[PDB]
Design a protein around this ligand. Structure first.
Ligand code: HEM
Ligand SMILES: O=C(NO)c1ccccc1
Ligand SMILES: [Ca+2]
Ligand SMILES: [Ca+2]
Length: 308
């Protein structure tokens, strides 16, 4: 079955508003929640598709994806997802799946942060288990080279350069722990020297935030220009060699970035072009091997599989 943005227009027409209201309230006490939610949707879709598998807690039959490299002590916002789920269940019992909920929450988070607004395709169902081993293999790491980043995306069906460059735009907001960039700051590739593709001035600022013997869990903004606003500034930073993590800067400085540089330049100079590309990329990502029809189920509690 094909996903459609009208899936709940009759069954739960106010699901979108319930989701938006929840995020709006949470934003007041946690301005980072929007970025965190978008990231959860990304990490869900890359592992066995957007089936809300990442929301499942540990059981005796399978381990949670929350312990995967990249998620452990990193992913967050789970309690917030429970809140909107409870609210939706009251309005429309056993109707909206966790997979779709997280998808709508991701779109609303982008829009609320100043990004584009659009209706996401819906109709996905929830998985019966979590896939830890798959998550540990499917999630791209910050130390991947451009080719490896392209393989990682192609691995799940996103085989277009625009997919990689556009979706990476998600780093236009949110935070990153010092641990992921320590090598770029003090000893890149066992050379004992910092990453040459990192702006020397910015290098000093980052070294202040991430001391050689400091707290590896300290947080740094992904976008030094507009840390909490979803815009195209992320691409501007790349042109000045101010991409925070290795995977960011490679989109512009890698010797294999022949096909990505043009997209970076384009996105950096046109918000409309980037927003349109981001929306198309997002819908493509949200269409990765979904469960529809009778497959999977409509979870009542995103943390656990239905008992029946
Ligand atoms: C291209 C491969 C990518 C790599 C290697 C990567 C890596 C990372 C890393 C290292 C962090 C920091 C986590 C932490 O320190 O706790 C992070 C955070 C984040 N990433 Fe990515 N990422 C990638 C793609 C994406 C995509 C496609 C999106 C979604 C459109 C995304 C959205 C985010 C957001 C918004 C955050 C901040 C989350 C928060 O502050 O809670 N990332 N990413
Ligand atoms: O966010 C990640 N994957 O997209 C990630 C973060 C840290 C280490 C490994 C992977
Ligand atoms: Ca998944
Ligand atoms: Ca920004």
């Amino acid at each position: 079955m094909q996903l459609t943005p009208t899936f709940y227009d009759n069954s739960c027409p106010n699901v979108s508003n319930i989701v938006r209201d929840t995020i709006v309230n949470e934003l007041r006490s946690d301005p980072r929640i929007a970025a965190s939610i978008l990231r959860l949707h990304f990490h869900d879709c890359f592992v066995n598709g957007c089936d809300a598998s990442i929301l499942l807690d540990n059981t005796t039959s399978f381990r949670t994806e929350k312990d995967a490299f990249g998620n452990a002590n990193s992913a967050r916002g789970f309690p917030v997802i429970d809140r909107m789920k409870a609210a939706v269940e009251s309005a429309c019992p056993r109707t909206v799946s966790c997979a779709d909920l997280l998808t709508i929450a991701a779109q609303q988070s982008v829009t609320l942060a100043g990004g584009p607004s659009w209706r996401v395709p819906l109709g996905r169902r929830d998985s019966l288990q979590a896939f830890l081993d798959l998550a540990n293999a499917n999630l791209p790491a910050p130390f991947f080279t451009l080719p490896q980043l392209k393989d990682s995306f192609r691995n799940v069906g996103l085989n277009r350069s625009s997919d990689l460059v556009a979706l990476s735009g998600g780093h236009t907001f949110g935070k990153n722990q010092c641990r992921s960039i320590m090598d770029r700051l003090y000893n890149f590739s066992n050379t004992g020297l910092p990453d040459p593709t990192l702006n020397t001035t910015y290098l000093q600022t980052l070294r202040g935030l991430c001391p050689l013997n400091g707290n590896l869990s300290a947080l740094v903004d992904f976008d030094l220009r507009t840390p909490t606003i979803f815009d195209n500034k992320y691409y501007v930073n790349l042109e000045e060699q101010k991409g925070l993590i290795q995977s960011d800067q490679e989109l512009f400085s890698s010797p294999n970035a022949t096909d990505t540089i043009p997209l970076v330049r384009s996105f950096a100079n046109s918000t409309q072009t980037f927003f349109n590309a981001f929306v198309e990329a997002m819908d493509r990502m949200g269409n990765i091997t979904p469960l529809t029809g009778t497959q999977g189920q409509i979870r009542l509690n995103c943390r656990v599989v239905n008992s029946n």
